[PDB]
Design a protein around this ligand. Structure first.
Ligand SMILES: O=C(CCCC[C@@H]1SC[C@@H]2NC(=O)N[C@@H]21)Nc1ccc([N+](=O)[O-])cc1
Ligand SMILES: O=C(CCCC[C@@H]1SC[C@@H]2NC(=O)N[C@@H]21)Nc1ccc([N+](=O)[O-])cc1
Ligand SMILES: O=C(CCCC[C@@H]1SC[C@@H]2NC(=O)N[C@@H]21)Nc1ccc([N+](=O)[O-])cc1
Ligand SMILES: O=C(CCCC[C@@H]1SC[C@@H]2NC(=O)N[C@@H]21)Nc1ccc([N+](=O)[O-])cc1
Ligand SMILES: *[C@H]1O[C@H](CO)[C@@H](O)[C@H](O)[C@H]1NC(C)=O
Ligand SMILES: *[C@H]1O[C@H](CO)[C@@H](O)[C@H](O)[C@H]1NC(C)=O
Ligand SMILES: *[C@H]1O[C@H](CO)[C@@H](O)[C@H](O)[C@H]1NC(C)=O
Ligand SMILES: *[C@H]1O[C@H](CO)[C@@H](O)[C@H](O)[C@H]1NC(C)=O
Lengths: 118, 119, 118, 119
């Protein structure tokens, strides 16, 4: 069973802590990233999909950055590799805030992140 | 004035969305309604609105926990006041499908956009 | 038959001209966009998929920006709407140039563009 | 020195790619080889490398014209000189599937990444 609750770290060096996942699949947590003024914490809220009670469920969460006007959403699946290790393969969209609707076209970045247990 | 997320919205695909009040922490919940040819499904959503600098056109993100499949979709965008004075949500999303092998991961994510206006 | 050859314009106001598509599905053209110093032209190269000689083929092309170090790639399908009009529904990735591999994560933007005959 | 596109590459998924010489206009052609469980397919690719400011780590883009399906994939990225001195192509791609109705357009595009190193 791949569980989201716990401590994770990714390929960029960012860390994330997720608490208990309730009966509805909802969970909260903290997302930690460094600036290079050193470390900043931002809350995250998301849900794990519980349809068919898969052992490798899909999920999604939003990171509400506390040091910028931007928002990032992550979606992915909690996998169990060949070694028996849990791994989160995710993709994200990073939304920047623009002051005019005419600039909307360049406000969204996309990328990936792989998380492993810390 | 300010663009507010709370309310009823409909998008360019015909899906409807209801968002509740946004608390002090910027959190909100709602419902997402889509069709399937009418036979309609209803799924819950949870997200947050960025409160930094209390901008009048904030960015936000939410997750839709589909109740009819094992998939998950996340949306992010900004609440704009268009040139004609109408409120409009410009969003982009990622649709994550469930795969059985970590080896099939590469083909599990679709991307697209959705524009929402008040219902 | 939805054909790529011709003049197109999109939702942002940019214009594009594509020449003849050869037997291998390859085509070239010009991509015009304004700055708001007014108009700039950049060449594009791409290919249309010819498998099963579909009347609504998929395609892809790269725009080699002549005023920046960035590159944009578009992929989409040439459709025929209910009115009988040709429409190109596309999605693109805009790659910015970063000076260090450590900044690679924030170098890619994503978006859409719908083109109609000009 | 400079990161050059010309040569043989292999990615994290196991696919191989051969890129030819890049002319003065920054144009190039090549071949993309992927497996299907070995039974391997071969498809042509055409793209360009950005020549502005003759950077040593240029951005580029190319299209792969799949010969076994009606799909098309485009890649874009940058040719980097990693910290250990190795040349590496960091890329992102969009995979466009063919749909029969403009109404199914929304679900026709997948997105992902690929990292290429010299073979
Ligand atoms: O507004 C921001 C907030 C920064 C966290 C950003 C992203 S979320 C996906 C990725 N995974 C992580 O763990 N962290 C990153 N970012 C931002 C915007 C612009 C620039 N810039 O240099 O221009 C730098 C950072
Ligand atoms: O698993 C699913 C759940 C369906 C809702 C999907 C997306 S979320 C972005 C877009 N905006 C909307 O309002 N609705 C859609 N979808 C799905 C997967 C595969 C296929 N298929 O035909 O293969 C059809 C639907
Ligand atoms: O480097 C660039 C080259 C500009 C053309 C950009 C994109 S390609 C997708 C979209 N569709 C179009 O027809 N045109 C646009 N762009 C760029 C980068 C940064 C900023 N900026 O303000 O920061 C502005 C433009
Ligand atoms: O139509 C296709 C053509 C297959 C090559 C696909 C992608 S291009 C990005 C990635 N990097 C690679 O080196 N190869 C892949 N693919 C396709 C579509 C659907 C399914 N399916 O199982 O449903 C399988 C393959
Ligand atoms: C979190 O990851 C490890 C856990 O101890 C730690 O060494 C590192 O400094 C932390 N990184 C960040 C960005 O907080
Ligand atoms: C929701 O949007 C309007 C609300 O009145 C309604 O006419 C339409 O049938 C609904 N669409 C769906 C997919 O539920
Ligand atoms: C191209 O689109 C129309 C075609 O005549 C023209 O009016 C407009 O000025 C042009 N736009 C750009 C960005 O070149
Ligand atoms: C290509 O990569 C190496 C080249 O020697 C080879 O071992 C491998 O089998 C090939 N893979 C594919 C998918 O053709």
């Amino acid at each position: 069973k791949c569980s989201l609750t716990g401590k994770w770290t990714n390929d960029l060096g960012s860390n994330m802590t997720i608490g208990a996942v309730n009966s509805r699949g909802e969970f909260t947590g903290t997302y930690t990233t460094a600036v290079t003024n050193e470390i900043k914490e931002s809350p995250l809220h998301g849900t794990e999909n519980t349809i068919n009670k898969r052992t490798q469920p899909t999920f999604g969460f939003t990171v509400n950055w506390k040091f910028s006007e931007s928002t990032t959403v992550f979606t992915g699946q909690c996998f169990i590799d060949r070694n028996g290790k849990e791994v989160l393969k995710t993709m994200w969209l990073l939304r920047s805030s623009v002051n005019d609707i005419g600039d909307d076209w360049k406000a969204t970045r996309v990328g990936i992140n792989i998380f492993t247990r810390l």
